[PDB]
A paper describes a structure:
To enter target cells, morbilliviruses rely on an envelope-anchored machinery, which is composed of two interacting glycoproteins: a tetrameric receptor binding (H) protein and a trimeric fusion (F) protein. To execute membrane fusion, the F protein initially adopts a metastable, prefusion state that refolds into a highly stable postfusion conformation as the result of a finely coordinated activation process mediated by the H protein. F protomers contain well-characterized functional domains: an N-terminal signal peptide, N- and C-terminal heptad repeat (HRA and HRB) domains, a transmembrane region and a C-terminal cytosolic tail.
Here, we employed cryo-electron microscopy (cryo-EM) and single particle reconstruction to elucidate the structure of the prefusion state of the CDV F protein ectodomain (solF) at 4.3 Å resolution. Here, to stabilize soluble CDV F ectodomain (solF) in the prefusion state, we fused the trimeric GCNt peptide to the stalk domain, and expressed and purified solF in mammalian cells in the presence of 3G (Sunet al., 2006, Singethanet al., 2010), a derivative of AS-48. Therefore, to ensure a sample of predominantly prefusion state solF for cryo-EM single particle reconstruction, a high concentration (75 µM) of the fusion inhibitor 3G (Sunet al., 2006, Singethanet al., 2010) was present during protein expression and purification. Also after reference-free auto-picking and initial 2D-classification, no postfusion-like 2D classes appeared. This shows that the fusion inhibitor 3G efficiently stabilizes the prefusion state of CDV solF. The geometry of the structure and the fit into the map was improved manually and through several real space refinement runs. The final CDV solF model is shown in Fig. 3A and B, which displays the known “tree”-like fold of the prefusion state of morbillivirus F proteins: The HRB domain of the three chains form a helix bundle, i.e., a short stalk, which supports a large globular head domain consisting of the three subdomains DI, DII and DIII. One DIII subdomain consists of two long α-helices, five shorter α-helices with less than ten residues per helix and a five-stranded twisted antiparallel β-sheet. The fusion peptide (FP), which is built from mostly hydrophobic residues and is important for membrane fusion, is buried between a DII and DIII subdomain of two different monomers. In the CDV solF structure, N173 and N179 are located at the top of the head domain in the DIII subdomain, and N141 is located at the bottom close to the HRB region in the DI subdomain. Interestingly, for all three N-linked glycosylation sites, additional densities were found in the cryo-EM map (arrowheads in the side view of Fig. 3A), which would correspond to glycans. Since 3G is a derivative of AS-48 and the compounds exhibit IC50s for membrane fusion in the single digit micromolar range against CDV and MeV, it is expected that both inhibitors bind to the same site.
Author numbering:
A (entry chain D), B (entry chain F), C (entry chain B): 227 to 583
D (entry chain E), E (entry chain C), F (entry chain A): 136 to 209
Write the structure that this text describes.
Amino acid sequence: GVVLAGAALGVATAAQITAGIALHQSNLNAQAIQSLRTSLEQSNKAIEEIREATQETVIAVQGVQDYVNNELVPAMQHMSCELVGQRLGLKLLRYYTELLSIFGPSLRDPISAEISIQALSYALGGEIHKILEKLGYSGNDMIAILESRGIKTKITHVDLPGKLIILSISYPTLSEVKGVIVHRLEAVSYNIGSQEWYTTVPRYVATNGYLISNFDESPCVFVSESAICSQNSLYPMSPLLQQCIRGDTSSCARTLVSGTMGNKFILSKGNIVANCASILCKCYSTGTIINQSPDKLLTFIASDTCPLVEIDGVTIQVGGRQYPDMVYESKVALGPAISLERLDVGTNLGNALKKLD
Amino acid sequence: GVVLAGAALGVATAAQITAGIALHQSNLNAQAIQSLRTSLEQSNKAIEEIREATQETVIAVQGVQDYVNNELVPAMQHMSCELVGQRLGLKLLRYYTELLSIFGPSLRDPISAEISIQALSYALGGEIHKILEKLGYSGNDMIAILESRGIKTKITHVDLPGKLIILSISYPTLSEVKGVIVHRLEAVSYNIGSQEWYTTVPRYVATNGYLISNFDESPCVFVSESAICSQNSLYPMSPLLQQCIRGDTSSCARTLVSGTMGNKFILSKGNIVANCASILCKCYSTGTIINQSPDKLLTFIASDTCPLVEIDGVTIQVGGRQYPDMVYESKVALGPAISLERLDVGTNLGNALKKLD
Amino acid sequence: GVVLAGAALGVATAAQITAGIALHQSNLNAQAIQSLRTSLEQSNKAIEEIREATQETVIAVQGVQDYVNNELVPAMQHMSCELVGQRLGLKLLRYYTELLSIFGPSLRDPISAEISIQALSYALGGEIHKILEKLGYSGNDMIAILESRGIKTKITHVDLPGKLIILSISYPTLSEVKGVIVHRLEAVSYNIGSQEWYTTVPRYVATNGYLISNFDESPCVFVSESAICSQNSLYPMSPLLQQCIRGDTSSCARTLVSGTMGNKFILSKGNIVANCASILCKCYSTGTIINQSPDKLLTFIASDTCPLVEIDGVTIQVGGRQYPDMVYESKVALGPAISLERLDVGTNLGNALKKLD
Amino acid sequence: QIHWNNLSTIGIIGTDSVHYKIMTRPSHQYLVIKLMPNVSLIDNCTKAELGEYEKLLNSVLEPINQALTLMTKN
Amino acid sequence: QIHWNNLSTIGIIGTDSVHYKIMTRPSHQYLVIKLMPNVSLIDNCTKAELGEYEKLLNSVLEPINQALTLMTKN
Amino acid sequence: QIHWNNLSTIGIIGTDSVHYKIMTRPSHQYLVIKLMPNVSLIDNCTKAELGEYEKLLNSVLEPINQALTLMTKN
């Protein structure tokens, strides 16, 4: 038998078809729905575990319980029934405002609707951790801490006399890809003549075997072992970006600084690398400043050149050299300018339009 | 007579001039303002209807009334006057924080200021529906439900001894354009060899007679009859976008997928169209899978090819064919890649800059 | 002596090094930390001034004090200990939700972390003005009003038995750049034949001597004397934008209108300039409308042409002419179209990709 | 109007097509924001906070007040 | 894999490198949003606001309800 | 400095021109965030929620704590 006949439906998409099939995996229609209905009357609980035979435990939510728990006996002198009626009427209309914001008519496709556990907060009573706590996650553990970002919900069923909607949530089950390593990049500023610059590159990069991907910053959280991306995160890259991070900076672009702020020095692998043609680098035990060739763009420091260095009032102890030494850089090209303002890109695409003309 | 002399004003814009003219349409200055002042002293109401002779009814707002309604007699033992004084002082400073966020010095042009009814919520007491309810709109009706997006307010007058600002709001009055039809597009994924792609096009399109416009997604709400755009919504399109949606896909661009997610099948007009060279499509009553030509990119299904089809564990009943059959596609070109990351567009505009050099 | 040895640290950045040096400027580790610990036990104050000898006054914050101040004696009949225990448990878990949003694992670099005084509000008890009030700023004065945007905080120290984090905030100290003038631009619409357009330029411009910069709109507040930018605000411009605002509009681009809305007239320096080939401009005392040459794009009005003008029902008194008169414009070029939709820029960069192919 | 026959070959299927309306503004209505919390019920309380707030109100309003007196008195 | 030796010459220094995990969904769980505040404790109160809200619920739900009856009954 | 005479011919009219200031930081001030709600008034209550929160605090803090011990002790 089918629940899906095309000549009477006409139009539906992939996720909608799979949601209908998964809804028919629920035999709630086959079974009497009165038992579900008749269970939920007397629950009187913010989050309750109502079990269903040969099925997952139903978890029942409520919205606004605590004030009604509060002002029964007191309000008899504390606040009049109408007064509290106005008071409730306010919150209820606020609750309607929230549900009309999220369950309302800006909600596009309720068959394929994907409603995250964060945004439902005041709809789900303003607490998000307790429901996931019921799921069996401590919040003291690897899943609850790293991943609270993307526990998703979907719409399954609507009943009109119960006036209620039935959702079904998923279980976070972590599994690493075989050859995924996430590198968090970072850069320092420098100068050429007097101009001050630094390199414009994507904040993160992600390599899966040979393949290197771009990365999202909004769902993706960083723990010391791995990068947890609770939503699908691996948006692709470009060859003219993927050539940048691997082995060449001939194509990687460069920017001018925001005011006078910039990173003029850094410690990496126990080595101080900086542009000491810009600020004060002075050998501490010897007592003299170090100059730089004008055909060079930075200056690196290991223990052998000077054991302790002063950079504008600090006292830095360094270690052994972990780097090759500074070969000439004037035969390795530098990137073009970057301007992050779509009007400029538009103006010059409108220039591209002029060139086409 | 005039209220507008240019040699003493100097500089003002179009909306500012019209706001000044509409302010002089108000004869509040001509009439005694004491009656307005002296009415508002004893209103003691969150939202009240104070009528004004030969003028629209003034509606008076308040901010924080209910707690002061609450703790008079109880606080005499419940909470000390200073304690409640500190408590109020907190909210009042929060109210000042909100009004300094919105009526403050980030507010650009208070003559032409346009302040929507949504953002004023905690300023207007945290309830938005009741004021529009006073306007005479049910919230059970066509206007309140479809259109709560864009009921706008403007600044009319400021009085210093009353310390108050006078706004005037408009009335939502819906009127359809003569030949406006809104189409919500949608697409499915596919592959060429092993590469997985889908078509990158604007989420909505809007045609007004011959003219086809782009569309906004933030104010525009969808009811079953029409698309309600409460703010001015019809931002223009480009010829090199308008050629895409009408009759040709030779210019429409295509993208690579986000992880492995994609729409490999769809039901449209009672017809299953999919790429069954990618996932499992198998004729149910016959019992065999269907293959696809490598010179083809999808596969369409009507009743005549197979009455019921299985797509990865489902059972689909289809109807009559509503489509022309698959002619060869290799003589119709495909779009270029799309990368939604302004650094890449910037990098390649900086390439365009290199080409200019 | 050092607190910074490179062979044992390995990797750290510029701001992290300076934060470590500034942490060692704090002799809290050198001094007994018990006195700090033992002071904070009995503070019992939302914001307290605990002084530290030969050091700035420590200011102690709390989170949720007032309800615990409220329901001790009353709750003995008003609300059960468990009931209030559940009630508190709710807020506490909400407090954990907020701190896990901001102090949690989405927080990237706590050595270089920059946490503004706005976002910490419900973490810092929901009041922002009082702490700055303690700093000695009225909120009636030039600094508190103009600049509440960017008072920054940074992380200094973490203690585990006290379970507490020690921040150190800065002092707003205003100082103007020597030759910085901020111009807020504005434009009106017009037509050529029947097409309706206006000029697309950056909302603000900022000139520092010869140099002209772009400008940010999110932190930058406008007082009548100066433009206050509490965060570093002066993001750079492009030569192909900087040539636009100074002395030429041959490169400045132009747009088509959003619906029928546009500015068809303006008053500047006591002069009405408009396109009166579009709407009704009629000499009031004479009684006749004024037409425009089709080789012209606007029409300017001073006292000498007509003393009082009517523009669609208004009565405008003008003054003396502050402008040169309308020379022909057909030998001065006009800008290309602008489309603010990255798909279009992407589509045409994908066209640029096709051109490269 | 739409040549959908070219559109389904790479899968462009419009799941909804509706009309479009725009709202118009024939008249107006008055709405007074009284910034002062009109609660004399305060029983001589909040005096200090309201007294600070009074002064706050000058930086709240005055710029706008002048901006409007330039529009009215000229 | 990364040729960092070309990267430090203009200062590209990766302060962290971790793995990557993705979550999978072997099973599901049921969760009923009862939109109606089940508080008969109301003692015959809020009757008017709940009665207005009942009607609100038609514009809240019905579109979705139909969207789901088209998926079920066909 | 601005050649406004070319700017009004297509209508560029600057309604405001002000100066610009930047804030500087001559000194600092100390501010202790005590994450623990110091309310012994709790009368032996919230014990379980605070006891869960104690453990929460390790995932709250420890990463940062280590990040800072690497800066101090090296």
